[PDB]
Design a protein around this ligand. Structure first.
Ligand code: HEC
Length: 115
């Protein structure tokens, strides 16, 4: 259900996640997260947006990737995101990331959920 709607919104459609964390990829994601995402997010505390340490436990990868890559489409069309907007407010969250960058950040998010 929520991953399918996230795929339809796009641009990412599918992310097949291998069982292991790729630590080098995650490390690039850590650096990116601390450049772009900590303007508004923390791992364990609310801030401008929701806490994210366990985002990969409550959401899937297509939703997370398309939040980074198409935040406007997600805000407009995805019911989970639309509800979070009513709670946290409307602001420019688009960091103009590449898919590569977003993928690295996802790997970091997966890693911190195992800490
Ligand atoms: C402040 C300008 C933000 C920046 C920069 C980033 N995010 Fe964000 N995020 C923000 C808000 C206010 C919200 C709630 C929705 C709304 O627009 O009001 C979010 C939400 C998310 C989510 C969804 C969390 C959930 O539990 O489903 C994710 C996965 C997310 N944000 C990720 C994320 C990442 C990885 C960022 C750096 C690339 C990032 N956001 C930037 C506010 C802001």
């Amino acid at each position: 259900d929520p991953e399918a709607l996230a795929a339809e919104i796009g641009p990412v459609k599918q992310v097949s996640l291998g069982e292991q964390i790729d630590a080098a990829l995650a490390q690039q994601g850590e650096q990116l997260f601390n450049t772009y995402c900590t303007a508004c997010h923390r791992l364990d505390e609310r801030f401008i947006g929701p806490a994210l340490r366990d985002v990969t436990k409550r959401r899937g990868p297509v939703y997370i990737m398309n939040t980074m890559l198409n935040p406007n489409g997600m805000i407009q069309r995805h019911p989970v995101m639309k509800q979070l907007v009513q709670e946290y407010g409307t602001m420019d969250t688009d960091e103009a990331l590449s898919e590569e960058q977003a993928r690295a950040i996802l790997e970091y998010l997966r890693q911190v959920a195992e800490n």
